[PDB]
C-alpha cells in the first residue's frame, strides 16, 4: 500500500543495555516463586530476563522512541494478558504511519 514501508534493522545492543539499566532481573537468578507474576522480556525472540513493573518501562520506551532516541522502526508490544513484552528490531518488517 501507498504509505507502507520496510524495516531495515538496527543493532539491539543499546536497547539491551538500556533495558538492563532500567531494572531487570537477568535470567540467571530468576526464580518463579519470588516473582510469581513478573513479566518476560523478549528482544527478537531471545529472552533476556524478567521485569517487575512493566507499565513504567512500556511508557518509557514509548516516550523514548517518540523523542527520537530509538530508531522508530523498533516496535514494542506489551501483551498484558500473558505478561509478555516484545522488542523487535530485525529488518524486513512492514509498517505504516499513524
Amino acid at each position: 500500500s501507498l504509505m507502507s514501508c520496510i524495516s531495515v534493522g538496527t543493532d539491539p545492543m543499546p536497547i539491551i543495555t538500556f533495558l538492563s539499566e532500567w531494572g531487570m532481573e537477568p535470567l540467571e537468578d530468576y526464580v518463579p516463586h519470588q516473582s510469581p507474576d513478573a513479566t518476560r522480556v523478549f528482544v527478537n525472540g531471545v529472552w533476556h530476563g524478567v521485569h517487575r513493573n512493566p507499565a513504567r518501562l512500556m511508557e518509557t520506551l514509548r516516550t523514548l522512541r517518540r523523542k527520537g532516541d530509538i530508531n522508530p522502526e523498533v516496535s514494542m508490544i506489551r501483551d498484558i494478558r500473558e505478561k509478555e513484552l516484545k522488542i523487535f528490531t530485525d529488518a524486513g518488517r512492514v509498517y505504516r504511519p499513524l
Binding site: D37, A55, I80, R81, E82, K83
Partner: protein, 114 residues
C-alpha cells in the same frame, strides 16, 4: 493429587506400600527419605474438564485500551465503571458468558441468569 517432593532432595515422593502395617509410605527414590501420606487417593484422571473461563486476571487489566467498557455496577463498590470480556478458555463448546471486572473494587463478577 498434587506432588510432594522429597525435602532432602527435590524429587517427588513415590507411592509405595507398607507390607505389614498397610500405610501409604510416600518414599523418595533418589534418597531414602520416606513420608506417610494423608489419604488413600493417589491417581486421578478427570476425563471431563470444564474449567478455565476466568483466566489471566492480571492486576492491571484496565491499562489495556482494547477492552470495551460498560455501565454495570460492581456489587462490592457500585462504581459505574467496569471492564468485560469473553470467557478465556477457548473451546468450541464454551458459552457467551461475560465476566465483568471493575477497576475500583478490582473485583470480578459474572452475569449468569440461571
Amino acid at each position: 493429587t498434587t506432588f510432594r517432593f522429597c525435602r532432602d532432595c527435590n524429587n517427588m515422593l513415590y507411592p509405595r506400600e507398607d507390607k505389614e502395617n498397610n500405610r501409604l509410605l510416600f518414599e523418595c527414590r533418589t534418597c531414602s527419605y520416606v513420608e506417610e501420606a494423608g489419604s488413600p487417593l493417589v491417581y486421578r484422571h478427570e476425563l471431563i474438564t470444564n474449567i478455565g473461563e476466568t483466566a489471566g486476571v492480571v492486576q492491571d487489566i484496565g491499562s489495556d485500551p482494547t477492552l470495551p467498557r460498560s455501565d454495570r455496577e460492581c456489587p462490592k463498590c457500585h462504581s459505574r465503571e467496569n471492564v468485560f470480556f469473553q470467557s478465556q478458555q477457548r473451546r468450541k463448546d464454551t458459552s457467551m458468558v461475560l465476566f465483568f471486572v471493575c477497576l475500583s473494587c478490582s473485583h470480578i463478577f459474572t452475569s449468569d441468569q440461571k
